[PDB]
Amino acid sequence: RWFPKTLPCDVTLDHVIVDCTDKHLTEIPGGIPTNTTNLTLTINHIPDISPASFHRLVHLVEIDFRCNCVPIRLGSKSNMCPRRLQIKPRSFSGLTYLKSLYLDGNQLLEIPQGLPPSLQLLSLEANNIFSIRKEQLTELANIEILYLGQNCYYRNPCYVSYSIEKDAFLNLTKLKVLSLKDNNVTTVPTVLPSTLTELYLYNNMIAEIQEDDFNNLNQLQILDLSGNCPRCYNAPFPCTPCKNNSPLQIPVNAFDALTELKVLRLHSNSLQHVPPRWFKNINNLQELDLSQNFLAKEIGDAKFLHFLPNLIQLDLSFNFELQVYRASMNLSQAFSSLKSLKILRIRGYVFKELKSFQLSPLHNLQNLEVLDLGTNFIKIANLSMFKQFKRLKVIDLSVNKISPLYYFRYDKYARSCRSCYKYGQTLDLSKNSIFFIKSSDFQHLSFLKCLNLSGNLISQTLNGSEFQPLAELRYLDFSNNRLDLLHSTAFEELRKLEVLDISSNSHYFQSEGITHMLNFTKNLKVLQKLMMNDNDISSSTSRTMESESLRTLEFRGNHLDVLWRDGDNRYLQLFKNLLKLEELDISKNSLSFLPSGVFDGMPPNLKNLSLAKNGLKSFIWEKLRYLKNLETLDLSHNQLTTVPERLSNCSRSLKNLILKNNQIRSLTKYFLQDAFQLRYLDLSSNKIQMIQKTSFPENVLNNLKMLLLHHNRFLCTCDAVWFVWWVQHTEVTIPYLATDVTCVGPGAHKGQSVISLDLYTC
Amino acid sequence: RWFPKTLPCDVTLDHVIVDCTDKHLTEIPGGIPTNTTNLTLTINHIPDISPASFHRLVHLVEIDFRCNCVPIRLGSKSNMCPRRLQIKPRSFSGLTYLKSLYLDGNQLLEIPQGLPPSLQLLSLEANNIFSIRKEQLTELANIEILYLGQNCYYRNPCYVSYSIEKDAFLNLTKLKVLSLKDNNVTTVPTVLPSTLTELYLYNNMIAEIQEDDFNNLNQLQILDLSGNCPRCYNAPFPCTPCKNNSPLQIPVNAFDALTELKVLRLHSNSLQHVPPRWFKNINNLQELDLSQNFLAKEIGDAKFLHFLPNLIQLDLSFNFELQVYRASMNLSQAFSSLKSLKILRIRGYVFKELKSFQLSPLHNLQNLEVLDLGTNFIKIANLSMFKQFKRLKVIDLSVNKISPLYYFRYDKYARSCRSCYKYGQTLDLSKNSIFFIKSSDFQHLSFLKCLNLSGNLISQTLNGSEFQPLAELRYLDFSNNRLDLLHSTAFEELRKLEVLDISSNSHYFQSEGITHMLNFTKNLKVLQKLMMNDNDISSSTSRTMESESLRTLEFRGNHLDVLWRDGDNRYLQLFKNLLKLEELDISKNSLSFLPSGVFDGMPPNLKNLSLAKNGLKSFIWEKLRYLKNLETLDLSHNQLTTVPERLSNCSRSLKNLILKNNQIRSLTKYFLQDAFQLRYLDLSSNKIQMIQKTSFPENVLNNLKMLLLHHNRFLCTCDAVWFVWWVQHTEVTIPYLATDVTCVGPGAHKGQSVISLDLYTC
RNA sequence: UUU
RNA sequence: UUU
Ligand SMILES: *[C@@H]1O[C@H](CO)[C@@H](O[C@@H]2O[C@H](CO)[C@@H](O)[C@H](O)[C@H]2NC(C)=O)[C@H](O)[C@H]1NC(C)=O
Ligand SMILES: *[C@@H]1O[C@H](CO)[C@@H](O[C@@H]2O[C@H](CO)[C@@H](O)[C@H](O)[C@H]2NC(C)=O)[C@H](O)[C@H]1NC(C)=O
Ligand SMILES: C=CCn1c(=O)n([C@@H]2O[C@H](CO)[C@@H](O)[C@H]2O)c2nc(N)[nH]c(=O)c21
Ligand SMILES: C=CCn1c(=O)n([C@@H]2O[C@H](CO)[C@@H](O)[C@H]2O)c2nc(N)[nH]c(=O)c21
Ligand SMILES: *[C@@H]1O[C@H](CO)[C@@H](O)[C@H](O)[C@H]1NC(C)=O
Ligand SMILES: *[C@@H]1O[C@H](CO)[C@@H](O)[C@H](O)[C@H]1NC(C)=O
Ligand SMILES: *[C@@H]1O[C@H](CO)[C@@H](O)[C@H](O)[C@H]1NC(C)=O
Ligand SMILES: *[C@@H]1O[C@H](CO)[C@@H](O)[C@H](O)[C@H]1NC(C)=O
Ligand SMILES: *[C@@H]1O[C@H](CO)[C@@H](O)[C@H](O)[C@H]1NC(C)=O
Ligand SMILES: *[C@@H]1O[C@H](CO)[C@@H](O)[C@H](O)[C@H]1NC(C)=O
């Protein structure tokens, strides 16, 4: 480079994007390009905005000035904002091309004035604005999107009811989206402009809908009235219900004007009845969320479903009656109306026994993909019943009591300041009480692609006779179980098995004297991936694992340290006969060193090797000559103190060397000499002081995709003159260059960034 | 003190004990007291011993010079010993009073010569000495104890058979203890001096005992011949069996001379028969270890037990037949002979069903205390059977398959280089497959004091009707289960319950929508201690826990960070009504801060409080005024950067302040002013540079039991003059004062210990 | 850093 | 650091 970075911001270029997110700034920086279209300054501590702020920046279409002063309870309690953001007059009115402005999370007291007529989007979430006046909104003639939420709630209280003048929004003739969520609003702020497409009014104090409230809103596609007269039972937040357990009162004709309506969410409204009359003039409804109400009875009746032939998703989760364990699930025949239904969820209805007939109302739903009966405390269920449901993508019985955060969020859509479904048909029996299994349990289920048994009781000496019906099965998640690997024939029946997870089945590996057989993988002739993480495996009766197919083995969280104890050669070839193995994760095996033999004993095609988080205190680098196809080596989070004298005499194939979080204090004189194949190198979080040219030749350095250097101990004396220069001028990506690549001394420069460092005197 | 305090060694004083264990020394230090009786230099890197080594140290009775050069595979692989310890002539022969010498782990090639005639004990374990000659042993006329083991085994191989000359030990007329374990010895080194009391010959290549091998050893109390013709099945180390699965051959009359013999260990000898004839002349046998042999059949017969009326412990663990799941436990009636038996262990016999009668041979054993049938894969057992065994201290069924390292060590006695039994009768059902429970399961067991159900399947909504027979129960370990705390009546039946462990029952706390009732503790009117660690508790339907009795609550590894989320007051009194609570562990709750109300909401008698390992980034010290009985505060492993301006305006009662492992860079000007009650203060592993007198006044400092200062960033300039002086002269214990309390600068003194620092120039 |  |  002719001139160094200097600017503390990622200047991408598409549109000219300047991104100064979380750069510990107290002023907008100098040097921002004149052609800047989008400028982001979110999470900084810039205490004011003036006409100087954006003076030259005439082509700005977007300003993201979020979270420079987030409200006290929302922010960090180490770094509390002492004084609200100040916005002086005239700061925005120069900006003719400005289309989006984001001033959320700045403790603003009022809608900021003097905004340009070009503005289409204004976002003021998480401020202290709880009174909307018509006069304050006339600057927004041309506004289309308006976020006003999260200014009066339990985490950012205003201590009063929210106030919106009569007809405040009406003369916003182009307004499409309006969000007043999380605000302590008491009524729908009539009259609303008919142009509205989305209206978010959830988590508020609206006790009633008047029948003229949505009179003119023909174009409305999304309505959310959730959390008004909330159902408070086991709320993980402060929850005040409406008096007498009352519901949100919605006149039978309240929706008659909403012809175009695609999404209606009535989550947590304490509803007991879903009067069919609501939906008379709503033909095209696609999505209905009725979760967290009191509709256990209404689900038996449910006449309203007769008016919903277009409905793709219906949510009836968490409608149980308190203190009531129903013996079964009374589903309405009405459900058969729901011709278009792709997704149905009925978690938290709370019943003991599921029988095949209770689901009969759904048998003809042609488009049905997802049936979710999770978290129902179901104790009894003949799983063969799902023979009818071969066409379903997912059948979720997760969290039950079978044995042969989302619904409880306050605001799941809240914005920040910053799987095996793809294998085919899936039956999720996770987190259930299944202690024993046998073939009959899976009879008529030969269609299943993924079976999830994670988090059951299964404490069984699997012999190959247990999943015998499941010959289409590609994925078995057997994690968080108590597999007893006595027989090498475990899992051999699953002849189509591509992926097996036996992670966190440590129980029986923790006790001495117990025969385990890790050689069970010869039998599984299509197995691509095996996960046996966190099993505490320190003993094995067989001494090799063999497979012709296995590409990936995750072996983290075991005791290879015991198996490879110095002077015990028995297990040095444990992975040798995994002949296709490209990827081996042996991180967290409390390996303080590697005996000779470990690398010779690796399989031939090893591409990607993780020894992360072991406590490695030493490492013979020369032994990487045995791993002739090695491309990524992960030695992160260890106690290594030195790099090889010559990486090119260790491994000519290595592209990615991860050394972050070690105890390296310098580099060897010719470290990277000749390592032309190297592309990525992470030396971050070490204790390096100096780096000379001999170690980091330009030949090799300038071909790196990335070089990570942050969190070291750089000495910024005139001995550092080459490195400081090189960093300052190189094209090579070096993340955190303007935040965490800093000098620690000498004196003057202590704390100073290497990129700002001007060492004239040399 | 008049003089620092410069020797790098704990000078205890009883006998004058000088201990320089692990002090990174390369020479014996100067200044060792002339009256030194015991000197320890184990784990250092002192490369030789000379007549200078001990010149002045004339009263020495013991030298522990262990592990200054441990063998390559036994030692650290970062810091491998480059060259064996050298012992020059005349180094020991000045020491007239020397009685013990420990030169283990120094890579010595030969028994060191020139030793004094006063010497009673010589230890040479973990060296490279594998040939014993008579000539080399004549210096030891007066030796009583001789450790020669661990010079030829898989971890420290000599590559040949061990050699002992005929009659090598015979002219050691005072020899009592001789250890040749772990040595590749092929025969008992005859003839042995009759004076031998203990003889350790385990883990060797001894295929046969000749009948003259122990002819003259009337005084022998302990014999160990274990691991000779080892049973190699699931050995966690390299194990070579005798050919044809042969046993260690022991002539029927081999023990006839051993009249005094108290302990006989025949562990891992591949024995099939225990011929009664062995024990004909051994009256007083107290301890017999027959574990890891092939005695499944012999246990049915077992005629030899008839000759063992004095036997206190019998071990028959791990004798199962490979590939054989016995339907029951064929115990001999012979067992009834064992009148004196206190402890019996029969782990790893491997059977399916235990019935009450199989134990009938033991019914009259009056002195029986411990019956251990662990690790037997027992699937069925009526636990009421133990009605007969009310007099037993412990009944261990740990590691089984019931549902209504030790035996596998190489050398368990190997030396290093450095519970609820007390409640009464105990039934350990740990690590079993018990999924459901009910009252009948515990019928006739009302005698039990401690029940251990740790590590079962138990996934049940305990209602108070499950342990109803157990009214003497003082201790329930319910850990590593799946408690479902739906009912507040859980555990109320156990009216004598002093201690309850529901730790690591996180399963059902990890899923949303599930009602949990932490208020179950009101009912339990004698409960002293409750452990509910590692439960992931982030949701609770009740908002208080009440108890009149509870002294200790361990709540580590939960989510108080969610329960006390800023702006949610509901849980701020969660512990208030634990009225007798003296001790609260709320470490590992990922608490980045504490909201106001947390300390006002603590119970009145809180004495010690742990907030360790939370990520605390700040802390209002002034709110410790609410904890008027606080005595220990543990804020270790957090991100705190400052201490209070005045600890005495925060808490006048605090005795023990633990601040280790934080980010403190300086102290407040008057930190400890007036804090006369303070006794312990740990400031170790921070980033402190200077400490002035104003912060650490003498009147407060000199009353400390302990002050921890290591692993800081001390700047050793003339500004440090008071602190360097104070550290140098004080009586107050400061651990690691000569190892990890060091200057980091300026220049000259970088790395130097504060205690050696001479500041004349200031 | 003899397990 | 809007969950
Ligand atoms: C939502 O508005 C209500 C009232 O309209 C606020 O509740 C009042 O709070 C003040 C100060 O705490 C009390 O003195 C009053 O008793 C309350 N009035 C009524 C009528 O209930 C509430 O604080 C607002 N919510 C938030 C989160 O700010
Ligand atoms: C124990 O002694 C045997 C000799 O009985 C040693 O085994 C020899 O090892 C060398 C390796 O260099 C072989 O070439 C010999 O042929 C082996 N001989 C036999 C008879 O097995 C053994 O190494 C010794 N054990 C240890 C642990 O040092
Ligand atoms: C087969 C049922 C009981 N069983 C058993 O006899 N054995 C035998 O126990 C011994 C140790 O595993 C061996 O003889 C082995 O074959 C067992 N080993 C394991 N791991 N699990 C069992 O359920 C079990
Ligand atoms: C009691 C039998 C089934 N059951 C139940 O009805 N409930 C009810 O389900 C709802 C959620 O826990 C509540 O109404 C609760 O009372 C349950 N809650 C838990 N935690 N565990 C059960 O086994 C269970
Ligand atoms: C830039 O701004 C426009 C309008 O605000 C927006 O639609 C676009 O996605 C923004 N692009 C980026 C990368 O921020
Ligand atoms: C199985 O269920 C658990 C939830 O209990 C989930 O974490 C996991 O991703 C699921 N497994 C797969 C393969 O989808
Ligand atoms: C697995 O291991 C043992 C040898 O330790 C052997 O008995 C068994 O037959 C092997 N089986 C397979 C399927 O590889
Ligand atoms: C000191 O040495 C004697 C004799 O060698 C020994 O018996 C004694 O226990 C040792 N004491 C201590 C405190 O190490
Ligand atoms: C219960 O059993 C486990 C062994 O599985 C043990 O760790 C624990 O200490 C035992 N509990 C008590 C209270 O002794
Ligand atoms: C608190 O009590 C004592 C200090 O008196 C200490 O031994 C104990 O381990 C401490 N534990 C916790 C959890 O605070």
UniProtKB/TrEMBL annotation, chains A, B:
**Per the UniProt entry, what is one GO biological process?**
canonical NF-kappaB signal transduction
Quote the record's binding site residues for guanosine.
Answer: F377, K401, D484, T515
Which residues does the annotation flag as glycosylated? N35, N38, N184, N330, N382, N452, N463, N519, N608, N649
Name the GO cellular-component terms. Answer: early phagosome; endolysosome membrane; endoplasmic reticulum; plasma membrane; receptor complex
Q: Where in the cell is it found?
A: Endomembrane system; Endosome
Is-annotated flag, keyword Transmembrane?
Answer: yes
One MF annotation (Gene Ontology) recorded for this entry: siRNA binding
Where does it primarily localize? membrane
Q: Does the keyword Transmembrane apply?
A: yes
Of which family is this protein a member? Belongs to the Toll-like receptor family.
- State what protein this is by name: Toll-like receptor 7
The record's gene field reads TLR7
Shown chain mapped onto the complete sequence: 28 to 833 of 1049
